[PDB]
Structure 1
């Protein structure tokens, strides 16, 4: 639907919280990868808000404790994902109309995100 555009809109903001929490708790924010559908888009049109497809919150060693990604514009079943690398925990945020960003039934607010990132930081970050 047009959800796709509002989901990408929500990808920007999740990224926004990442950069915030990052500067805030003074932990490396690392752009992990750009959309190949931008790099290799040629004369073709591109209206997406960012060019960053995989982000992360890494520690001092650079090993990440939080990984984030959304699926490209040309792939099916678009979801935005959150993974705690090393702790086996994966999340799948969709986008509902009126409700907003959900992990199924529970809304994914800044607050709830910050909670996860903290839990992760304290537990996982090697240095």
Structure 2
């Protein structure tokens, strides 16, 4: 699918929410990974508008409470995932042409995401 473009612009969005939340709540942001296919890129063209494959909001003592990973450029069955550790939550945001970025069928928007984050924060984080 042509989903590729549409996912990536959404991925920037997703990050954006995380940065605000980080300064807002008094919890840090931490880049985890960068795309292999950017480091080891070596003459290739480029499409991805950021370089961050995984990133997280941490309690402040280095344990994460919220993980966020996009699928890398090449691989099939692309998705964006979220996960709360220690509480087995594995969320699969897909993109659907004709809706937006959806968790299955429910639209993911900022309010949604922020609420999810605070329920995460409150259970798992000690900060």
Q: TM-score higher than 0.5 here?
A: yes
SS in 1 for 2:65: strand
Find the aligned partners of 1:103 and 1:86 in 2 and give their Cα distance. 21
Find the aligned partners of 2:123 and 2:56 in 1 and give their Cα distance. 16
Superposed CA RMSD in Å reads 0.8
Cα distance per residue 1:8-57 (max 9 Å; x no partner): 11001001101111111110110111000000000111121100000100
TM-score by length of 2: 0.97
Find the aligned partners of 1:46 and 1:107 in 2 and give their Cα distance. 29
Gaps of 5+ in 2: none
Find the aligned partners of 1:71 and 1:60 in 2 and give their Cα distance. 26
Cα distance per residue 1:98-122 (max 9 Å; x no partner): 3101011111110000001000111
Residue 126 of structure 1 and its aligned partner are, at CA, apart by 2.7
- Cα contact 1:8–1:48 (8 A) shared by 2: yes
Residue 3 of structure 1 and its aligned partner are, at CA, apart by 1.6
- Cα contact 1:61–1:126 (8 A) shared by 2: no
Gaps of 5+ in 1: none
> Equivalent residue for 1:49?
49
